[PDB]
């Protein structure tokens with residue numbers, strides 16, 4: 001009884017036993033947000049989906065983007081969503097993953113970082129990196145919440161092609177398959193989400209609408225990277241064009257680590273931001289960093305008329321929940337500063353309207 | 367090379383290397399909240415503190431209160447906060463922890479659940495409990511983030527007392543000293559927060575005011591439990607007297623063994639103060655929505671006779687609830703996200719409660735105000 005009452009759990013068991021701790025809610029939620037609907041495009045609706053499922057997807061997408069930092073020659077990302085076969089696949093070019101056995105861990109690097117918990121190349125904070133990768137859980141959580149998870153990576157360097165498959169929530173893997181290789185390097189993660197774990201019948205419209213919009217986010221938050229979806233290249237060419245989709249407008253590429261866009265808001269303070277290609281959908285201090293700067297410059301009263309669009313690269317970011325929707329790192333510990341051109345600060349005044357304040361010269365009488 | 371680049375961290379290493387993920391922010395934050403200041407009492411001011419620090423304290427406090435759902439006979443919780451010595455201790459009576467060796471982990475239970483990760487007596491969902499604990503990290507996290515963590519529990523049932531100290535972020539631990547016992551069993555854990563991991567120099571005024579308010583929260587949210595703060599007994603007997611601190615017209619009702627509600631008129635927009643299994647749900651959750659909405663409706667009703675989200679904005683509601691396997695969206699359990707369908711119980715206010723609700727300074731203010739706005743011209 002003492003043994004049945006006081007239990008010790010393995011890590012894998014705990015993740016499956018307490019999902020919401022690692023990937024967020026595995027229950028349905030309903031809330032308004034920007035999605036990209038088939039035939040209608042990017043719009044702001046009400047949506048019902050499981051955050052846990054959107055997350056394991058986001059994890060593999062960001063890893064794809066992250067590879068851009070690791071290798072600048074990366075040119076594009078190819079996303080594939082197929083509801084009927086319940087298949088998702090993310091592909092990226094750029095330096096593949098070293099297909100060689102890891103001397104300390106005693107196993108091939110790919111099998112190590114996609115099949116073992118707490119494995120990562122972002123564990124050394126002296127590197128001060130601007131990747132979304134950080135905790136080393138991501139790819140594994142997706143693997144842990146898939147019925148089938150496949151990893152295929154190719155590195156010219158070690159001149160080999162690695163391919164392996166996991167099944168039943170990473171509870172069993174297939175036989176590692178290696179082949180000689182010599183070509184352009186690529187990596188492709190193909191997974192079948194364990195929809196049972198999320199109490200879903202299939203990849204419905206909403207969740208698909210969310211994911212598709214994320215591919216657009218990537219296409220807009222990364223640099224010199226082309227994003228493909230189901231075979232068609234998305235029409236995003238930088239942040240500005242991306243921001244455009246919402247406005248169909250003061251802009252500025254402060255530097256290599258920033259880019260901001262402002263515009264009026266008839267619906268209170270509106271913000272849309274990204275940190276290392278992560279969709280910080282609730283906010284963060286990186287967004288409050290620019291806002292409060294722009295605001296004060298021309299002065300809460302004014303902020304509420306703003307629709308800010310921020311896209312930054314931050315060193316070793318720090319977030320709230322597992323849904324990483326609200327960043328917190330201190331503006332001091334950013335790795336760079338964001339200051340507007342005299343121009344911007346100027347071409348940003350054409351929001352000012354003491355008109356409502358002036359017109360406030362009404363009189364209340366019986 | 368490859369070995370230096372791709373690393374595998376250990377569970378303990380990982381927690382220290384990535385705090386925010388287990389205990390929330392390890393940085394200072396500034397927000398408005400109720401706290402209990404020395405000599406002033408409960409007040410709403412601005413506060414600057416580290417969530418992670420508050421969390422490790424809250425994990426041991428809630429653990430003490432969780433024991434009440436384990437031994438209904440528990441009757442007291444004693445809390446000690448010694449800034450000067452950077453020491454905190456939380457004492458509780460009632461059934462102590464089984465001082466015996468765990469046959470599968472081949473080590474004593476106290477040592478197992480306070481020193482090994484992923485250990486809990488709440489991994490059995492079926493059991494259907496209303497404790498704050500559910501993930502088996504809490505205690506280990508207070509330990510991992512303390513320079514010294516001492517665990518002492520006495521158990522009459524096993525005729526023994528246990529006592530062991532851990533040190534340097536659960537990196538090392540002294541020897542386990544056992545002794546005979548047969549008195550009233552109790553559990554007390556003492557720890558010294560590794561302030562440096564929090565960028566702190568000491569337990570300042572702010573963080574202590576918050577830790578002290580939690581002590582009062584426990585007094586107000588646990589059933590028949592006297593609470594002591596540094597040897598002195600907090601003057602709180604049950605939820606109603608707890609709610610009274612916040613006030614210098616109030617509606618009350620203990621719906622059932624798992625729900626207690628207090629309602630008053632608010633002048634600063636919707637207001638809520640609540641608890642789920644003694645956890646401070648500062649940002650609300652489905653449980654507050656469930657009680658509030660049910661009240662707003664009966665009020666909107668008397669509105670038609672003579673405004674909707676407008677009604678909810680005149681309300682100051684207090685909710686103490688016991689929920690089964692509660693869920694939170696954050697590293698702070700400030701917002702309880704479970705659906706009412708899975709609560710494990712219901713909470714339909716009494717016909718006698720709504721009646722009284724219709725009479726407090728509420729409708730007479732909406733109607734008074736609707737009237738006001740009608741007889742107004744804009745010149």
Ligand SMILES: Nc1ncnc2c1ncn2[C@@H]1O[C@H](COP(=O)(O)OP(=O)(O)O)[C@@H](O)[C@H]1O
Nearest residue numbers: 063064067113120121133134135136137138139
């Ligand atoms: N598309 C990709 N290309 C190259 N390496 C990748 C890719 N996706 C993941 N990785 C590697 O796998 C690890 C990522 O696993 P993950 O669970 O997401 O942890 P994190 O992103 O926090 O580092 C890193 O060590 C990274 O180098």
Ligand SMILES: Nc1ncnc2c1ncn2[C@@H]1O[C@H](COP(=O)(O)OP(=O)(O)O)[C@@H](O)[C@H]1O
Nearest residue numbers: 429430433479486487499500501502503504505
């Ligand atoms: N004060 C206490 N009295 C009795 N048992 C306790 C106490 N504190 C902790 N425990 C035991 O230790 C475990 C709690 O560890 P914790 O890390 O807080 O996990 P949990 O999520 O279960 O609360 C449980 O198995 C519980 O029975």
Ligand SMILES: [Mg+2]
Nearest residue numbers: 063133138139
């Ligand atoms: Mg990752």
Ligand SMILES: [Mg+2]
Nearest residue numbers: 429499504505
């Ligand atoms: Mg606990």
